[PDB]
Amino acid sequence: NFINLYTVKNPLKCKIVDKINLVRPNSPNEVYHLEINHNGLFKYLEGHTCGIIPYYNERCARLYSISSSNNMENLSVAIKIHKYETNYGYCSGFIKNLKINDDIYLTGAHGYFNLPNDAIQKNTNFIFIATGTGISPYISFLKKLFAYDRNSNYTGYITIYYGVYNEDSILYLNELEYFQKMYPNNINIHYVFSYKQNSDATSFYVQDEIYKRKTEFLNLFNNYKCELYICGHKSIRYKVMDILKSHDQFDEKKKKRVHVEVY
Amino acid sequence: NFINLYTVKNPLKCKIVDKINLVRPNSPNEVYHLEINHNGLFKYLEGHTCGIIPYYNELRCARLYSISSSNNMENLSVAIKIHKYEQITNYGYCSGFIKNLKINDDIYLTGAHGYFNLPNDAIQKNTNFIFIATGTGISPYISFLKKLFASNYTGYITIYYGVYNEDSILYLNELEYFQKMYPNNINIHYVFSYKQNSDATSFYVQDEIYKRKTEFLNLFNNYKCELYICGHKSIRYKVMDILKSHDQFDEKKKKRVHVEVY
Ligand SMILES: Cc1cc2nc3c(=O)[nH]c(=O)nc-3n(C[C@H](O)[C@H](O)[C@H](O)COP(=O)(O)OP(=O)(O)OC[C@H]3O[C@@H](n4cnc5c(N)ncnc54)[C@H](O)[C@@H]3O)c2cc1C
Ligand SMILES: Cc1cc2nc3c(=O)[nH]c(=O)nc-3n(C[C@H](O)[C@H](O)[C@H](O)COP(=O)(O)OP(=O)(O)OC[C@H]3O[C@@H](n4cnc5c(N)ncnc54)[C@H](O)[C@@H]3O)c2cc1C
Incomplete structure (x- = not known):
């Protein structure tokens, strides 16, 4: 089935297709919607999460609920950027600096x-x-x-x-x-x-x-x-x-x- | 103190100087000794661990490894068992990373634990x-x-x-x-x-x-x-x-x- 098709030991190489702020100017939050090209390879049901391995180059994967439906070509995910004391969370800092067309590595479904x-x-x-x-x-x-x-x-x-x-x-x-x-x-x-x-x-x-x-x-x-x-x-x-x-x-x-x- | 000088938020980029199998023919696991060039930048006392972040590349997730070198040595060292498990063999997350590592590759360390x-x-x-x-x-x-x-x-x-x-x-x-x-x-x-x-x-x-x-x-x-x-x-x-x-x-x-x- 879909659960753990990809794990940290065989993550799926994907590509950032889009990255949109989800919030409006009066929000104290920074949250990005990421659209991710997985070439049809990432299998999921509605409600599943995917894991992202920060900084990976060919737990440790942070889980993100998938916000897209099955029959969309790409998948999407909404990621809050966590900050503290300036300083970012591990995956948060990675997602902050991520650009369109960048590689991203996924695990799941979870x-x-x-x-x-x-x-x-x-x-x-x-x-x-x-x-x-x-x-x-x-x-x-x-x-x-x-x-x-x-x-x-x-x-x-x-x-x-x-x-x-x-x-x-x-x-x-x-x-x-x-x-x-x-x-x-x-x-x-x-x-x-x-x-x-x-x-x-x-x-x-x-x-x-x-x-x-x-x-x-x-x-x-x-x-x-x-x-x-x-x-x-x-x-x-x-x-x-x-x-x-x-x-x-x-x-x-x-x-x-x-x-x-x-x- | 030297604890958490480097974290996963800011790891220290380092180089592999040598990679030596520490075990002999009748050992069923590989264990690699790694000599790591940290440009004198990694600070530690004897007994401390460093974290290695598998597969990291500059833009609980680091595995800890006891440093086997003393302060006075220029490069640091570490001995890493390559864990195998069955079901076709698979490797542990960091184990598979260390297995494939070559001399002169980059490795990112976290900072005295x-x-x-x-x-x-x-x-x-x-x-x-x-x-x-x-x-x-x-x-x-x-x-x-x-x-x-x-x-x-x-x-x-x-x-x-x-x-x-x-x-x-x-x-x-x-x-x-x-x-x-x-x-x-x-x-x-x-x-x-x-x-x-x-x-x-x-x-x-x-x-x-x-x-x-x-x-x-x-x-x-x-x-x-x-x-x-x-x-x-x-x-x-x-x-x-x-x-x-x-x-x-x-x-x-x-x-x-x-x-x-x-
Ligand atoms: C099932 C599941 C589904 C999830 N779905 C989503 C989702 O859809 N969207 C989403 O945005 N997140 C989701 N999450 C959470 C997501 O995984 C977070 O981004 C992650 O858990 C925290 O990310 P991080 O690596 O950036 O922070 P981490 O580095 O892991 O730190 C965790 C928290 O501690 C704080 N922290 C770290 N270091 C310090 C410090 N020393 N001092 C003070 N505070 C510190 C960080 O700022 C962060 O807020 C989900 C989690 C689970 C388990
Ligand atoms: C303080 C401290 C000091 C340490 N010092 C050293 C040291 O000096 N040298 C050293 O070699 N290690 C040391 N360790 C342990 C080291 O971190 C190991 O490499 C690591 O914990 C195992 O990492 P891994 O990423 O390869 O395996 P992981 O994938 O993280 O661990 C899982 C373990 O279970 C097995 N496994 C994984 N998935 C499955 C599965 N699906 N089914 C069945 N089995 C599975 C793996 O083979 C592995 O043995 C230290 C740990 C700590 C906490």
């Missing part, structure tokens, strides 16, 4: 944060919870479910809770705006702005929006039997579980409907 | 040592021996060294040299496991210490030896178990135990 195979036929309902770059897997989910290029056979309902610093920090804004305008009876997006660079504070703002919208959120999960996806900083996970645990019956059978990709 | 150092009073105080090694665990001790013997250090060194077989003793030449040059001050006990199982190898080292438990404990306790343990993780507790049994083992003794296992 992860199990995928759609159910039933999804488009079963018209599965979804809750997608995201913070920061945690939106990327959902971008690929949407591109798949609504056959991006109204080619959609999918008539399920999707609710997105997306927490970012501010409006200018919303990643893939144009794509989110597109799906919402094209499919206004299938998609509901709730932006939460924290105005805090601290991820643990952002996740509390998301938990707090969900609490404010608990009747929506909890009927979606307990009544309409949505699949619940959580992606982003590790602090949201237990905060979303607390909401489920404190407000209604919550057993291992309901836990089967909770999918988590945190970091 | 660890606390596996000699006490700085060692030469003036004539400190006695117990060095326990398996496999590549010998490397820091080769650097120790190079430092201690400058020479008027008259301490007493005991070395326990477990390897697969005689063709697998790393730095055999250096060990034999030091043992023969200072025959009253260096005592080496070798153990061959004859099994390609790292856990077996450390069992046999423990077994050789058990045979000599009285000598061993009387060296550590009465001659106040600094005890060093280096190599595969499995030796750690097997040696600790010997310091537990037939011994009170207080915490002024634990000041005298140094561990670098992996």
